[PDB]
């Protein structure tokens, strides 16, 4: 493929500035499964010499479905940390369900699925809609500001707090820990320590279990989460369901500002198709990886036992063989078989309906209170090699 020597699709220096859209398009055309070599000390915490870049939607789905072959536990699923991270700090992530394999993952998922019943999520609709409306009214009344802080940030956090029934007076400390919990190497956040925030949030959650959906997870059906598993579950919601939904809201609004005919259509009919096109477009998790437990032949390439494969959701969601005109933002897109919530399989996002509900509620509120919003200056991207984040974006709410 026509790529620079040494190019690495997980390099945080690229994502601080842009998504490498042209370079993914070139792999899909010229080398859809391609070995991305990494030199010593430049592998983002891994020392194995590189990984297979997976760029096509069917391959991402095949890997996700074959979790008997493609492990989440062996190396975790995050494909890039700071280059000098200790291997013990990657391995400690194995205590969240995202980084486990069957049978351990199968037991936790079954218990945690108590939290994500359709009924549990739907119960949160009326409070999240009242919060959404108020957030948008507050932003309109401020006139201009940072849309990430004023519109995107609070409602995903209040969704987790309402799911967990956290008392009001404890939400400010909960939200502070949760916004320090996912790792990045951005200079704006160089003074955060996700390790203290993780310890502190696990201790808060364990005290909450001891005092008792929390009661349904920690009450024996004799199966239940232990008190420490409930802590690890609250840590996992902080990393899985906070910045991801926040970034789907910012990048959905960036797409509406760049495609004004789609925002006019959305304001009229608020279509059911919009939330999934916002997630496809935003692809807030750019990639997650697996490790092969045995040799496996994937679309003609011989993947070998122990090698990593990195699923680039950001490429697969723009796969020209699967989406008609994938570079067109189309809020009526149908069909829409995107992998923004992962490939279907054992670890498919358990929060997907809660995220869709959060997205729908906030965009309805923005349409109702700020229909003529316009950007003031360019979004500031986050320096991460796997999370596609926007730190700040200045907009004029009144237009």
259 binds ligand HEM (CB under 6 A): no
> Considering the complex, what minimum distance in angstroms separates the CB of residue 2 from ligand HEM?
29
> Which residues from 116-175 bind ligand HEM, rule CB under 6 A?
160
222 is in an annotated binding site: no
240 binds ligand HEM (CB under 6 A): yes
Of positions 32, 76, 241, 252, contacts ligand HEM by CB under 6 A: 241
> Considering the complex, what minimum distance in angstroms separates the CB of residue 38 from ligand HEM?
22
> Considering the complex, what minimum distance in angstroms separates the CB of residue 351 from ligand HEM?
2
Of positions 343, 379, 385, 389, contacts ligand HEM by CB under 6 A: 343
Residue nearest to ligand HEM (CB): 351
361 binds ligand HEM (CB under 6 A): no
Whose Cβ is closer to ligand HEM: residue 140's or residue 161's? 161
CA 62 to chain centre: 20
331 binds ligand HEM (CB under 6 A): no
Distance, in Å, from the CA atom of 365 to the CA atom of 353, rounded to the nearest integer, reads 18
Of positions 109, 212, 224, 392, contacts ligand HEM by CB under 6 A: 109
CB 280 within 8 A of CB 317: yes
The interface region with ligand HEM, picked from 41-49, 130-138, 198-206, 334-342 by CB under 6 A, is 334-342
Of positions 326, 342, 379, 389, contacts ligand HEM by CB under 6 A: 342
Sketch the per residue contact string, 59 through 98, with ligand HEM: x for CB under 6 A, - otherwise: -----x--------------------------------xx
Distance, in Å, from the CA atom of 42 to the CA atom of 13, rounded to the nearest integer, reads 12
183 is in an annotated binding site: yes
Distance, in Å, from the CA atom of 302 to the CA atom of 269, rounded to the nearest integer, reads 48
Of positions 131, 280, 333, 347, contacts ligand HEM by CB under 6 A: 347
389 binds ligand HEM (CB under 6 A): no
370 binds ligand HEM (CB under 6 A): no
57 binds ligand HEM (CB under 6 A): no
Of positions 284, 379, 385, 389, contacts ligand HEM by CB under 6 A: 284
In three state form, how does the secondary structure of the chain look? CCCCCCCCCCCHHHHCCCCCHHHHHHHHHHCCEEEEECCCCCCCCCCCCEEEEECCHHHHHHHHHCCCCEECCCCCCCCCCCCCCCHHHHHHHHHCHHHCCCCHHHHHHHHHHHHCCHHHHHHCHHHHHHHHHHHHHHHHHHCEEEHHHHHHCHHHHHHHHHHHCCCHHHHHHHHHHHCCCCCCCCHHHCCCCHHHHHHHHHHHHHHHHHHCCHHHHHCCCCCCCCHHHHHHHHHHHHHHCCHHHHHHHHHHHHHHHHCHHHHHHHHHHCCCCHHHHHHHHHCCECEEEEEECCCEEECCEEECCCCEEEEEHHHHCCCCCCCCCCCCCCCCCCCCCCCCCCCCCCCCCCCHHHHHHHHHHHHHHHHHHCCCCEECCCCEECCCCCECCEEECEEECCC
230 binds ligand HEM (CB under 6 A): no
The interface region with ligand HEM, picked from 2-10, 171-179, 346-354, 368-376 by CB under 6 A, is 346-354
201 binds ligand HEM (CB under 6 A): no
291 binds ligand HEM (CB under 6 A): no
Annotated binding-site residues for heme read 349
Annotated binding-site residues for substrate read 183
List interacting residues with ligand HEM (CB under 6 A): 64, 97-98, 109, 160, 236-237, 240-241, 244-245, 248, 279, 284-285, 288, 340-343, 345, 347-351, 354-355
């Amino acid at each position: 493929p026509n790529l620079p020597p040494g190019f690495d699709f997980t390099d945080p220096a690229i994502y601080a500035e842009r998504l490498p859209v042209a370079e993914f398009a070139e792999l899909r055309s010229a080398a859809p499964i391609w070995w991305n070599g990494q030199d010593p000390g430049k592998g983002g915490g891994f020392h194995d010499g590189g990984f297979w870049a997976i760029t096509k939607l069917n391959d991402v789905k095949e890997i996700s479905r074959h979790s008997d072959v493609f492990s989440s536990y062996e190396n975790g699923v995050i494909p890039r940390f700071k280059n000098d991270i200790a291997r013990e700090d990657i391995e400690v992530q194995r205590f969240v369900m995202l980084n486990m394999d069957a049978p351990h993952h199968t037991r936790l998922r079954k218990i945690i699925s108590r939290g994500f019943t359709p009924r549990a999520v739907g119960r949160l609709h009326d409070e999240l809609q009242e919060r959404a409306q108020k957030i948008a009214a507050e932003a309109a009344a401020a006139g201009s500001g940072d849309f990430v802080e004023q519109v995107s940030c609070e409602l995903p956090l209040q969704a987790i707090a309402g799911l967990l029934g956290v008392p009001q007076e404890d939400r400010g400390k909960l939200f502070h820990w949760s916004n320090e919990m996912t790792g990045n190497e951005d200079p704006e956040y160089a003074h955060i320590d996700p390790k203290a925030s993780s310890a502190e949030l696990i201790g808060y959650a364990m005290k909450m279990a001891e005092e008792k959906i929390v009661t349904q997870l920690i009450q024996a059906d004799g199966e239940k989460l232990s008190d420490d598993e409930f802590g690890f579950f609250v840590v996992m919601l902080a990393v899985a369901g906070n910045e991801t939904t926040r970034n789907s809201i910012t990048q959905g609004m960036m797409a509406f500002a760049e495609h004004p005919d789609q925002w006019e259509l959305y304001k009229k009919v608020r279509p059911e198709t919009a939330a999934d096109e916002i997630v496809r477009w935003a692809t807030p998790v750019t990639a997650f990886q697996r490790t092969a437990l045995r040799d496996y032949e994937l679309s003609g390439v011989q993947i070998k036992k122990g090698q990593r494969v990195v699923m680039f959701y950001r490429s697969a969601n723009f796969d020209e063989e699967v989406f008609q005109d994938p570079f067109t933002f189309n809020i009526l897109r149908n069909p829409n078989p995107h992998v923004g919530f992962g490939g279907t399989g054992a670890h498919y996002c358990i929060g997907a309906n809660l995220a869709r509900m959060t997205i729908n509620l906030i965009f309805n509120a923005v349409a109702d209170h700020m229909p003529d919003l316009k950007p003031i200056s360019a979004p500031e991207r986050l320096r991460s090699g796997w999370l596609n984040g926007i730190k700040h974006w200045q907009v004029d709410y009144t237009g």
